[PDB]
Structures are given as structure tokens and as C-alpha cells.
Ligand binder design. Structure first.
Ligand code: SAH
Length: 273
């Protein structure tokens, strides 16, 4: 109702992102696709992976109830009738910032063509170790040429609104951000409250994320604001009538919705050879 169109939009953003890199993986002649969905939540991306026609998915999250719900929705998905091919799936409760996923994989030798981290990475920036660990978990088992893709708040946009504010808070009808306070932005542990009409988040300084990713032999493919990404993707009609069947620019979202969503960026990294 209130944020339905915002959610819809986020789903559309993820769809097109996931879509783009599934094709890139396939154009490198990769037949059977293996994917790690890191911080999978309740399975909002299950259907995107099913229509990407991947062969194996690992869903993991720190919240077990979410993992279990993700599993049940998966069970329902291919207990549908005359349901075309579905990936095999593996479900793991774990803190991907404090625990090594390879130690919990049923198959410890397993590799991935894509790690998808959607609206997750920023939780790991509580400390250097947690950040490095989530990056490791996202990137260590990636095959060369494989991709690390995701969505996280854009720190530049967050700071800009903070410093433009009369307080340590800012927002509108839809969202509210509250810093522990402005002027002080440590690389790790920069805490702010994020309210979508409620969970603590950490600032992700992207040039820092870029450097730390190098440790795992990753090179940046691109980084784009939600706005830029939105503007580019709709010059292709497959995506736009996709968006309309799923149901600042004048543009598809109210000005307040645009303020909420324009907070985010999309990124992709590639595993080097
Ligand atoms: N340290 C951590 N390790 C793994 N998952 C975490 C985490 N901290 C938070 N999360 C999870 O990240 C999720 C963010 S909401 C994103 C859900 C899903 N990827 C989607 O796009 O719909 C939540 O499910 C939360 O439980």
C-alpha cells in the first residue's frame, strides 16, 4: 500500500541487475549456473533465479526464520504444477560477517558464477573484520570471470543530506535516517538508524569497498546510483514494460519515493583470472 510501489521498484531494479549478469555469465559459455544469494531474506529473489534458469542456488541469512521461510517458499515454488525446471537449493543460517560459509556448505569445494548481495553489505561494516569476512564469503568461492553484484546505500548521498539537515536526522513521509552524529565518519562502525515505514545500518564508503574487494582478486565492473541505473535501463523496452506489468524524473515514483530510493547505488565486481 504505502511502500508497495517502492518495493515493486526495488524488485524491478534487482530483476534487471540479476538479468544483466546472468546473460554475461552465459555469454562466457557457462552452461550450468551456480549462485550464492547472500542475505537472502525470505526469498524475494527466488522467482528471479528461477526464471534465470540457474541450476543451483545457496540461500543464506543471519535470520533463521527468514531462511526457513525462504526454504518453504522454495518448496512451494516447485511443488506448483507442471512447473518447468527449477534449481536445486541449499539453505544456511549463518552470520556471513562472523562465520565462514565454506565451513557450512554441504559441498566445501563448491564454486559460484554469481554472488548476489541485495540490501545486505552495509550491515557488515560494523568493523573491519566483519566487512572483510562478508567480502570473503561473497568472493572467495567465485570462479574466475564470475561476479559479485549488489545494492547498498550510497554514502555520498547519505552524507550530503545529513550535512544539509538542521539535525542529525532527515527524511519524509516514507523514510527517516538518523545518525549517531555528523562530522564523524569512521571507515568502520559509522552507525545510523534507518526507518522504512527499523534496523541499524553502517556507512559503506564505496572507494573503501572497492579497495578491500581487491584482496579477493576482484575488479570493479561498475557502480551506479539507483537513479543513473534507472535512467539507463529504460532505454530498453523489455525492461520498461516489465516494470509496467510489475506495475528526479516525473517518472514512475512519487517525489518522496524517489528520495527514498535514490539513497541507494548498485554495484558489480568481477573475479579476475
Ligand atoms: N551479518 C549478516 N549476515 C547475513 N545476513 C545478514 C546479516 N545482517 C543482516 N542480514 C540479512 O540481510 C537481509 C537484508 S533485507 C534483504 C533481503 C533480500 N536479499 C531481498 O532482496 O529481498 C535481512 O534478511 C537480514 O537478516
Amino acid at each position: 500500500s504505502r511502500i508497495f510501489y517502492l518495493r515493486n521498484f526495488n524488485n524491478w531494479m534487482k530483476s534487471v541487475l540479476i538479468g544483466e549478469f546472468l546473460e554475461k555469465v552465459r555469454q562466457k559459455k557457462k552452461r550450468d549456473i551456480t549462485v550464492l544469494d547472500l542475505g537472502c531474506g525470505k526469498g524475494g529473489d527466488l522467482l528471479k533465479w528461477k526464471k534465470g534458469r540457474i541450476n543451483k542456488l545457496v540461500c543464506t541469512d543471519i535470520a533463521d526464520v527468514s531462511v526457513k521461510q525462504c526454504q518453504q517458499r522454495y518448496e512451494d515454488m516447485k511443488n506448483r504444477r507442471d512447473s518447468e525446471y527449477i534449481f536445486s537449493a541449499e539453505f544456511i543460517t549463518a552470520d556471513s560477517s562472523k562465520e565462514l560459509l565454506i565451513d557450512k556448505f554441504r559441498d566445501p569445494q563448491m564454486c559460484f558464477d554469481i554472488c548476489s548481495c541485495q540490501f545486505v553489505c552495509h550491515y557488515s561494516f560494523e568493523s573491519y573484520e566483519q566487512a572483510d569476512m562478508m567480502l570473503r564469503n561473497a568472493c572467495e568461492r567465485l570462479s574466475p570471470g564470475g561476479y559479485f553484484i549488489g545494492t547498498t546505500p550510497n554514502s555520498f548521498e547519505l552524507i550530503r543530506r545529513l550535512e544539509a539537515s538542521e539535525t542529525e536526522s532527515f527524511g519524509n513521509e516514507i523514510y527517516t535516517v538518523k545518525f549517531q552524529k555528523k562530522g564523524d565518519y569512521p571507515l568502520f562502525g559509522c552507525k545510523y538508524d534507518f526507518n522504512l515505514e527499523d534496523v541499524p545500518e553502517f556507512l559503506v564508503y564505496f572507494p573503501l569497498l572497492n579497495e578491500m574487494a581487491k584482496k579477493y582478486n576482484m575488479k570493479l565492473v561498475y557502480k551506479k546510483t539507483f537513479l543513473e541505473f534507472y535512467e539507463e535501463k529504460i532505454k530498453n523496452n523489455e525492461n520498461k514494460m516489465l516494470l509496467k506489468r510489475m506495475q528526479l524524473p516525473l517518472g514512475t515514483l512519487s517525489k518522496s519515493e524517489w528520495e527514498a530510493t535514490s539513497i541507494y547505488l548498485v554495484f558489480a565486481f568481477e573475479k579476475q583470472q
